[PDB]
Amino acid sequence: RAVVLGGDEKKARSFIQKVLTISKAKDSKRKEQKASQ
Amino acid sequence: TQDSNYVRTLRQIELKKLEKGAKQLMFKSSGNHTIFVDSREKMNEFTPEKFFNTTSEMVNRSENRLTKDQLAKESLDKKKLKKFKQVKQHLQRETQLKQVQQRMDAQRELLKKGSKKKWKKQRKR
């Protein structure tokens, strides 16, 4: 939904997207290693 | 996707924010200056250096034309270009938010109950 955010919100909203991407890659890789075993 | 209330509040942020942003900014004077003297011999001998008691450099700077007796950074100014345009971006946003509110406004009157032959004239009881 279209919204306008301040600088403080924006600098944060990048980070949770950052953390979530790291977790997904971390989770996916662990799944692959166990799957290979 | 956004309603009249949400858009209205945002523009009110930027109008006040614009008001503060302009206030901090200085602004070089553009008014016109005249000097009144006594006699025509006093005319032809007049020069800005004498009357102001300043050097040629300081005559141009009207804001702080220090008397000569009193006289006896690209990144820094680039950030100044950022400050002035920063107020400009708010100015652009405010009119942009104004347009959507106007368009949101107009649709609500079209939805409003009326004759609408352009509104035909019918004293609302």
Next chain:
Amino acid sequence: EGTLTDHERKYLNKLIKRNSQNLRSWDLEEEVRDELEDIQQSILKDTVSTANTDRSKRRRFKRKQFKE
């Protein structure tokens, strides 16, 4: 007392150069004031408006005049 000798009139004149040279740094460059001035006018003209006040002056004068 205006008893300045030639030597003294040079030392102060040097001080004029020294202080004036210092104030030049805070006076900023000539290249920056070009776009600052250009940006400066844009923001005034919207907040100061003047589309109506200028127009209103003409209307009064035109109405004020005789029409033949």
Next chain:
Amino acid sequence: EDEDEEEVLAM
């Protein structure tokens, strides 16, 4: 919800 959100008029 941040995924549902979308940012505009960025500065």
Next chain:
Amino acid sequence: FPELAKLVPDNYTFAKLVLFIKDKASLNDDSLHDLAALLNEDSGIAQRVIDNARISMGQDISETDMENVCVFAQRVASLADYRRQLYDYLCEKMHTVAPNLSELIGEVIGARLISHAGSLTNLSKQAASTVQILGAEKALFRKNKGRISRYLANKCSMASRIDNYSEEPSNVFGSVL
């Protein structure tokens, strides 16, 4: 009467003086001596208040307002008097409970250290190093300076144990300590 607020900066003095000078219009030679008796004229305020009261610009407030001020000012007088009475009570009790601790450092500081610990028993059980850090927020015990603090901290821990585990602690050991 805004000007008076400046004159007698000791805050407790105002509540007494305002109690006497309810209205700045009332200015008498006898009243000047009375307010002169209040505190001392060495600061010269007694003449200043009479002068200032004559030449002032404070807008007159209603009688009900003044009644609030003196009654409200009277309240500040009571708490200060009670606080002084309570302070003495702390001194006497502190001597009775922990004479060693009180004599070594002082009643008020010692009472604080107990409050930091939460109880006299807690303070005694705690080791020497932490007792130094227990009072490290308010500088209770305060390179050579640090050594005295640490040395005093152990002795402060020394006194606490004697007071806690003695049914009727004495001050003989605290003094030599």
Next chain:
Amino acid sequence: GARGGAKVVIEPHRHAGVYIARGKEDLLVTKNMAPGESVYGEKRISVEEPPTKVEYRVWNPFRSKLAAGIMGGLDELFIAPGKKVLYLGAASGTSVSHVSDVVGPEGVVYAVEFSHRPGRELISMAKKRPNIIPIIEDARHPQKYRMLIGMVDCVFADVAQPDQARIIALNSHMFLKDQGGVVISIKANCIDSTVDAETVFAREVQKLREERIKPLEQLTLEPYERDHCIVVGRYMRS
């Protein structure tokens, strides 16, 4: 811009009692006679000096007409520390309080105003400033408040009335010293909107000349304000 945490360099203006705040942005600035409070919400600058903490007030050209003159570069201002000042048309403390700082504790400011409702704001502001003597009176009849006012070194009038020249005339004779100062803010629209601004300014100068007032300079307030000019004059009784 001049955000709360910004650090600025402050140095004096050419005129005594007027200062500029260097740093990133240049702000015209005056000392605060009553530190720790803002009359009309302006920004305040504070400086540590040996250490006592002296405060300073930001000074908006767009709000005070005299302030726009400073940006204009007025040659001479009779408003200076240690001088009695008569401010006619003191609607509120937006400008009078800032005149009050320039004069400093030794100087005094006589604020004259007519409308009751702005007067309440003026009186309250005067409570924080001992050097400001407010006078809720009609400037058209200076005899009413001859009781309260001595000689004045400089007379400032921002009254926006068609007959402001006469109002300036009466007070200057009664109150302004010989060789004294007079600073007038002129609005063409209130006096005569039909004719262009310049003629009104030329017209007003003639009125002051008829009143033994010699004009020294005239300065318009663009871009801060439109169709205005500040006429600086001297009272030669002889």
Next chain:
Amino acid sequence: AANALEEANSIIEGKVSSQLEKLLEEIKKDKKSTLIVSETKLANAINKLGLNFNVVSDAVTLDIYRAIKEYLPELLPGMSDNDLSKMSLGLAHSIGRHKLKFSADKVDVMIIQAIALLDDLDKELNTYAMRCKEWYGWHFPELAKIVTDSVAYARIILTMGIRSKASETDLSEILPEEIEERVKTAAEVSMGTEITQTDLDNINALAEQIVEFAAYREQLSNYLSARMKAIAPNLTQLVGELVGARLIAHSGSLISLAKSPASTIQILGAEKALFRALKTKHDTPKYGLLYHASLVGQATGKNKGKIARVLAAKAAVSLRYDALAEDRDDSGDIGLESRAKVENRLSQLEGRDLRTT
């Protein structure tokens, strides 16, 4: 100063004052003397007194006055320039207050401090009550659960200092019959330990502060009630005392509230819900601070919102009458008539039945 103001007004009105009068008959002995008066109006009035003076008031005499007042501090020995300025400074405000029609009973700055003071006292009194409860609770921990009121609790310590006194001490005036016997029973089976008279003396002093302050808190409440009835009467009849002060305090001044539209008055106190609601497209509040008014309380269901809108509109009408009135009568009549209209509005909305009969 009161004399000085009276003399100053007489000058402004052009009237001859008694102090001016008596100071002249002292000079009446001088036959055929010319009097120079700065003003013609005062000059004319003095001529009517019949004194043997040729009164002259001319533009040329201004030169004489100009020099006199320029060198006045030197002309008048014993009076310094700084004192003269202080003389003028104080007099001007008194004159300014008089012309302004200022009255000590119509200043809104008093109320905003009183309500702020009332809140500060309330926070103050809870804390000391807690201190009394757990300090004295050491001697008798069971009283807090039985009697919850701080002021009533404190009076228990004053009447009975030690639990042994509970056997003979009578608590009827503080507590009802059923409660007072509970504390008596708890006293013998109590848990706290005996306390020295020294401890008892100081806890009694603390209790004395509890009971005394509560009295002053009551006086401040009554004091606050009177001021609004004098400053903003018409509001008091409509919205009430406690709520009305908060509205004025919220805006910071009576005029500030007077200038606000009725919609703002309706939601003056729920902005946090408002601005959170506005930015997230959720329904906005409809009561604000006005929820605590009596009229809103009488309403029920959705009618509370409807009354809130109507009362806020009428509250503005009553408020704006109070603020901008030059010659308001301290009667609250406009508040009264507006109150009837809302009550008439409330009756018919409440009379309306949603369910079909």
Next chain:
RNA sequence: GCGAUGAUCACCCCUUCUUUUUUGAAGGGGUGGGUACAAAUGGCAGUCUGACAAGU
């Protein structure tokens, strides 16, 4: 005339001349940070919509 009742252990403010000559002469303060308290008409921060509703 020691000690387990406890010793020890953030930043900045060679040149010239000369010589019985391998000889002689000269050139405390400011920053930063931590703890508790008070004020700010300093910031987040922007005051909901607006003609219909109820009855036969």
